[PDB]
């Protein structure tokens, strides 16, 4: 994390940051990673 | 005697020796810099040329002498 902090403090170039660090303006497609317990009895978490 | 011809030749050649190397260095550095970062192109070229030109001034000086000795 502090490695991210230091490196991003530099290489601020948008073209340089075009790799992943770039913010897509259109945001036409999005993706959600959902991590859900595998077995139930968990309570209200699986649903929440 | 023919010493004026030798002078003209020395002027042109010795003027050409240094600027050739220098201009090679300038353009090589600018090309590498643009290849690394394209968006800065229009700036470095703007500096590139106002560097590059200066060098040939010296060379042109020799060429000027290469005619002044000639005539």
Curated annotation (Swiss-Prot), chain A:
Subcellular location field: Cell membrane
**What disulfide bonds does the UniProt entry report for this chain?**
none
Q: Which residues form a coiled coil?
A: none
Role this protein plays: Produces ATP from ADP in the presence of a proton gradient across the membrane. The gamma chain is believed to be important in regulating ATPase activity and the flow of protons through the CF(0) complex.
What protein family is recorded? Belongs to the ATPase gamma chain family.
Q: How does it assemble?
A: F-type ATPases have 2 components, CF(1) - the catalytic core - and CF(0) - the membrane proton channel. CF(1) has five subunits: alpha(3), beta(3), gamma(1), delta(1), epsilon(1). CF(0) has three main subunits: a, b and c.
Q: What is this protein called?
A: ATP synthase gamma chain
Q: Which organism is it from?
A: Chloroflexus aurantiacus (strain ATCC 29366 / DSM 635 / J-10-fl)
UniProtKB/Swiss-Prot annotation, chain B:
Q: Which GO terms describe its biological process?
A: proton motive force-driven ATP synthesis
Described function: F(1)F(0) ATP synthase produces ATP from ADP in the presence of a proton or sodium gradient. F-type ATPases consist of two structural domains, F(1) containing the extramembraneous catalytic core and F(0) containing the membrane proton channel, linked together by a central stalk and a peripheral stalk. During catalysis, ATP synthesis in the catalytic domain of F(1) is coupled via a rotary mechanism of the central stalk subunits to proton translocation.
Ranked from the top, the taxonomy reads: Bacteria, Bacillati, Chloroflexota, Chloroflexia, Chloroflexales
Q: What is its main location?
A: membrane
For this protein, the record's NCBIfam families field holds:
ATP_synt_c
Task: Please describe the quaternary structure of this protein.
Answer: F-type ATPases have 2 components, F(1) - the catalytic core - and F(0) - the membrane proton channel. F(1) has five subunits: alpha(3), beta(3), gamma(1), delta(1), epsilon(1). F(0) has four main subunits: a(1), b(1), b'(1) and c(10-14). The alpha and beta chains form an alternating ring which encloses part of the gamma chain. F(1) is attached to F(0) by a central stalk formed by the gamma and epsilon chains, while a peripheral stalk is formed by the delta, b and b' chains.
Q: Which PROSITE patterns does its entry note?
A: ATPASE_C (PS00605)
Give TM regions.
Answer: 6-26, 49-69
Q: How does it sit in the membrane?
A: Multi-pass membrane protein
- One GO term describing the cellular component: proton-transporting ATP synthase complex
Q: Which domain of life is it from?
A: Bacteria
GO MF annotation terms? lipid binding; proton-transporting ATP synthase activity, rotational mechanism
Question: What is the recorded name of this protein?
Answer: ATP synthase subunit c
Task: Please give the family membership noted in the entry.
Answer: Belongs to the ATPase C chain family.
Q: Does the keyword Cell division apply?
A: no
Cellular localisation: Cell membrane
